[PDB]
Amino acid sequence: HKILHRL
Amino acid sequence: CQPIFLNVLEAIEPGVVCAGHDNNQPDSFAALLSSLNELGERQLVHVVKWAKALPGFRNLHVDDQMAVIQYSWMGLMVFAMGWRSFTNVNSRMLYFAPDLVFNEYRMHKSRMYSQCVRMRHLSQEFGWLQITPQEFLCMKALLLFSIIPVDGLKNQKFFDELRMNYIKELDRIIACKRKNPTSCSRRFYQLTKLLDSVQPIARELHQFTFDLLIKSHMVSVDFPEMMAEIISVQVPKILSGKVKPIYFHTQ
Numbered sequence: 001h002k003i004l005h006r007l
Numbered sequence: 008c009q010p011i012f013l014n015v016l017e018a019i020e021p022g023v024v025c026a027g028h029d030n031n032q033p034d035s036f037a038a039l040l041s042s043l044n045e046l047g048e049r050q051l052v053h054v055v056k057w058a059k060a061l062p063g064f065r066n067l068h069v070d071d072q073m074a075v076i077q078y079s080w081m082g083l084m085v086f087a088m089g090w091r092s093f094t095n096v097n098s099r100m101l102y103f104a105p106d107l108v109f110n111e112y113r114m115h116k117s118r119m120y121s122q123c124v125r126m127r128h129l130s131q132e133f134g135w136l137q138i139t140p141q142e143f144l145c146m147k148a149l150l151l152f153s154i155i156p157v158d159g160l161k162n163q164k165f166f167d168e169l170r171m172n173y174i175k176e177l178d179r180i181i182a183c184k185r186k187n188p189t190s191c192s193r194r195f196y197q198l199t200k201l202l203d204s205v206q207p208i209a210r211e212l213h214q215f216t217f218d219l220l221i222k223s224h225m226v227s228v229d230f231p232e233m234m235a236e237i238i239s240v241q242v243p244k245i246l247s248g249k250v251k252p253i254y255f256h257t258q
């Protein structure tokens with residue numbers, strides 16, 4: 001998960 | 008003088024992205040849509056890396072950086088796909104990826120035929136309007152800053168300033184070989200109309216993918232992690248009227 005993460 | 012802004016846009020433009028589709032198998036709704044979803048997930052990775060390298064993007068609040076990407080990805084990807092279709096196959100087909108090209112038969116099989124025809128019309132416009140590679144690059148960047156929440160962004164001020172700067176760069180590119188105010192004005196009208204046209208198309212696709220996710224288990228269509236999250240959390244905000252595009256013209 002962790003949203004898009006690589007933002 | 009050195010065109011610093013344009014030098015940067017050309018330098019960061021993403022390379023080729025493949026969908027991983029098996030073109031040896033007969034076409035089916037499930038396989039075609041699952042591949043489009045995977046291409047979306049793969050393109051999302053390149054869009055994030057691209058956006059983070061845009062002039063001034065870091066001026067935005069961290070939460071807004073994520074938000075603008077989550078709201079405008081559909082329009083950004085559709086615009087780029089239309090350009091690829093024009094440059095690679097003269098709009099004869101929809102060039103989603105080297106390994107995922109849609110002819111009319113596939114448009115029909117995908118169950119989103121009407122939307123596909125509208126995207127082909129967009130592709131044709133790149134040729135009819137003689138859009139230059141440089142205009143394409145500036146317009147695509149502007150699309151990242153064309154959809155916002157009615158409730159406002161964390162730092163709406165920084166966003167408004169950045170958007171204004173990209174509009175100014177578009178004015179500059181238009182004035183390059185044009186030494187007449189009327190000629191520049193006419194071109195700005197044409198380009199803003201083209202940009203507005205992307206929004207209604209993106210809205211139809213937003214509705215289509217939303218409905219598909221809700222019934223995905225019934226039609227055997229797979230949605231990757233990021234796509235499923237964005238379509239169930241962010242997309243409904245646009246469909247319910249909480250997030251809306253910024254139109255240049257009224258319509």
Ligand SMILES: C[C@]12CCC(=O)C[C@@H]1CC[C@@H]1[C@@H]2CC[C@]2(C)[C@@H](O)CC[C@@H]12
Binds near residue numbers: 088102103219
């Ligand atoms: C953005 C993509 C994938 C990237 C691209 O080239 C444009 C294209 C437009 C249709 C989208 C597709 C991603 C997956 C979606 C959202 C499907 O669920 C239905 C509509 C598809």
